[PDB]
Design an enzyme around this catalytic site. Structure first.
Site, PDB file in Angstrom:
ATOM      1  N   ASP A 293      -4.673  37.236   3.450  1.00 41.75           N
ATOM      2  CA  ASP A 293      -5.638  36.150   3.382  1.00 41.75           C
ATOM      3  C   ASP A 293      -5.031  34.836   2.808  1.00 41.75           C
ATOM      4  O   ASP A 293      -5.550  34.280   1.847  1.00 41.75           O
ATOM      5  CB  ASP A 293      -6.876  36.613   2.577  1.00 41.75           C
ATOM      6  CG  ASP A 293      -8.039  35.617   2.630  1.00 41.75           C
ATOM      7  OD1 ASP A 293      -8.182  34.871   3.626  1.00 41.75           O
ATOM      8  OD2 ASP A 293      -8.818  35.564   1.669  1.00 41.75           O
TER       9      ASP A 293
ATOM     10  N   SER B 147     -12.272  30.533  -4.127  1.00 41.61           N
ATOM     11  CA  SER B 147     -11.386  31.101  -3.128  1.00 41.61           C
ATOM     12  C   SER B 147     -10.326  30.126  -2.697  1.00 41.61           C
ATOM     13  O   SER B 147     -10.615  28.965  -2.478  1.00 41.61           O
ATOM     14  CB  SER B 147     -12.157  31.596  -1.897  1.00 41.61           C
ATOM     15  OG  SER B 147     -13.057  32.604  -2.294  1.00 41.61           O
TER      16      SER B 147
ATOM     17  N   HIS C  59      -9.707  32.904   4.877  1.00 44.56           N
ATOM     18  CA  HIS C  59     -11.156  33.059   5.076  1.00 44.56           C
ATOM     19  C   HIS C  59     -11.890  31.754   4.878  1.00 44.56           C
ATOM     20  O   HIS C  59     -12.974  31.598   5.449  1.00 44.56           O
ATOM     21  CB  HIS C  59     -11.788  34.126   4.161  1.00 44.56           C
ATOM     22  CG  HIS C  59     -11.429  35.541   4.520  1.00 44.56           C
ATOM     23  ND1 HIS C  59     -10.743  35.893   5.670  1.00 44.56           N
ATOM     24  CD2 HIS C  59     -11.673  36.693   3.853  1.00 44.56           C
ATOM     25  CE1 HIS C  59     -10.609  37.207   5.698  1.00 44.56           C
ATOM     26  NE2 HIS C  59     -11.171  37.715   4.616  1.00 44.56           N
TER      27      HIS C  59
HETATM   28  N1  LIG Z   1     -15.018  37.444  -8.485  1.00 46.37           N
HETATM   29  C1  LIG Z   1     -14.194  37.562  -7.283  1.00 46.37           C
HETATM   30  C2  LIG Z   1     -14.535  36.443  -6.322  1.00 46.37           C
HETATM   31  C3  LIG Z   1     -13.567  35.564  -5.872  1.00 46.37           C
HETATM   32  C4  LIG Z   1     -13.923  34.553  -4.977  1.00 46.37           C
HETATM   33  C5  LIG Z   1     -15.221  34.417  -4.495  1.00 46.37           C
HETATM   34  C6  LIG Z   1     -16.209  35.311  -4.937  1.00 46.37           C
HETATM   35  N2  LIG Z   1     -17.483  35.370  -4.463  1.00 46.37           N
HETATM   36  C7  LIG Z   1     -17.920  34.935  -3.238  1.00 46.37           C
HETATM   37  N3  LIG Z   1     -17.109  34.506  -2.241  1.00 46.37           N
HETATM   38  N4  LIG Z   1     -17.954  34.036  -1.254  1.00 46.37           N
HETATM   39  C8  LIG Z   1     -19.247  34.143  -1.604  1.00 46.37           C
HETATM   40  N5  LIG Z   1     -20.380  33.809  -0.910  1.00 46.37           N
HETATM   41  C9  LIG Z   1     -21.582  34.005  -1.475  1.00 46.37           C
HETATM   42  N6  LIG Z   1     -21.696  34.532  -2.706  1.00 46.37           N
HETATM   43  C10 LIG Z   1     -20.611  34.897  -3.452  1.00 46.37           C
HETATM   44  N7  LIG Z   1     -20.799  35.321  -4.724  1.00 46.37           N
HETATM   45  C11 LIG Z   1     -21.915  35.089  -5.472  1.00 46.37           C
HETATM   46  C12 LIG Z   1     -22.913  34.118  -5.193  1.00 46.37           C
HETATM   47  C13 LIG Z   1     -24.056  34.050  -5.974  1.00 46.37           C
HETATM   48  C14 LIG Z   1     -24.220  34.928  -7.050  1.00 46.37           C
HETATM   49  C15 LIG Z   1     -23.241  35.876  -7.344  1.00 46.37           C
HETATM   50  O1  LIG Z   1     -23.361  36.729  -8.411  1.00 46.37           O
HETATM   51  C16 LIG Z   1     -22.102  35.943  -6.563  1.00 46.37           C
HETATM   52  C17 LIG Z   1     -19.337  34.711  -2.896  1.00 46.37           C
HETATM   53  C18 LIG Z   1     -15.829  36.293  -5.852  1.00 46.37           C
END
Ligand SMILES: NCc1cccc(Nc2n[nH]c3ncnc(Nc4cccc(O)c4)c23)c1
Length: 216
Positions: A84, A172, A41
């Site tokens: 992924d 990620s 991704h």
């Molecule tokens: N916790 C699991 C995990 C693993 C990898 C990536 C992620 N999150 C995300 N992957 N991509 C994203 N694009 C935009 N926002 C996202 N999360 C975000 C951003 C601001 C505040 C908040 O509380 C969460 C993510 C979450």
């Protein structure tokens, strides 16, 4: 990483920043001299930064590498969370040293015991405001059994607890390491115990990873 600490500089010599147009985009893991594993991704000009702690400060081990080939898993798709994984072949074999060293990965296809503590590291965001750290962060997280974690968690995926300590945006593709062995790749919500971090189990893809590396 939410709820973590600045890592000891270069104590995770396998750690890679996958970069897009000169900026950190995703984590990755060095798994051979010429190969970095990350998340499909995540994928413009793609490079890989090895031997880093700080993104901005001079370090003797920091080296940036161009990517010859990007190999997503055949079954990966933009809609789904399944398959992924992404293998990035560097422009040349990486210079190995104390700060740059491949991490071996689990090839025995069996789950990590629930409750095991695994290390997740990255330069992803450190708070809900999207603050991006200069230096590598990490956190230890316990594995959550698949039953508790479950609808969507297949046998090819695993979960870790996300109770304040969690992976987040920009983490990620980064490594989940249990007892010094790569067990998962970070693939959504952050810091919310009700939604565990989801990680791709590298052991489920052992045959595919070998097959790609064996084309050398
Ligand atoms: N916790 C699991 C995990 C693993 C990898 C990536 C992620 N999150 C995300 N992957 N991509 C994203 N694009 C935009 N926002 C996202 N999360 C975000 C951003 C601001 C505040 C908040 O509380 C969460 C993510 C979450």
């Amino acid at each position: 990483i939410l709820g973590g600490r600045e890592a000891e500089a270069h104590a995770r010599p396998y750690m890679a920043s996958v970069q897009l147009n000169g900026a950190h985009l995703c984590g990755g893991v060095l798994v051979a001299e010429q190969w970095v594993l990350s998340a499909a991704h995540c994928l413009g000009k793609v490079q890989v930064l090895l031997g880093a702690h700080s993104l901005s400060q001079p370090e003797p081990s920091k080296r940036l590498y161009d990517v010859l080939r990007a190999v997503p898993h055949p079954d990966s798709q933009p809609d789904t969370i399944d398959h992924d994984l992404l293998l990035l072949q560097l422009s040349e074999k990486a210079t190995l040293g104390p700060a740059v060293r491949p991490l071996p990965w689990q090839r025995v296809d069996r789950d990590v015991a629930p409750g095991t503590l695994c290390d997740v590291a990255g330069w992803g965001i450190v708070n809900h405001a999207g603050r991006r750290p200069d230096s590598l962060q990490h956190v230890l997280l316990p594995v959550l059994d698949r039953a508790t974690c479950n609808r969507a968690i297949t046998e090819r995926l695993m979960c870790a607890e996300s109770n304040r300590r969690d992976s987040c945006k920009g983490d990620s593709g980064g490594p989940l390491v249990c007892g010094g062995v790569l067990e998962g790749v970070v693939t959504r919500v952050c810091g919310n115990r009700k939604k565990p971090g989801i990680y791709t189990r590298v052991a489920s893809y052992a045959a595919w990873i070998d097959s790609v590396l064996a084309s050398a």
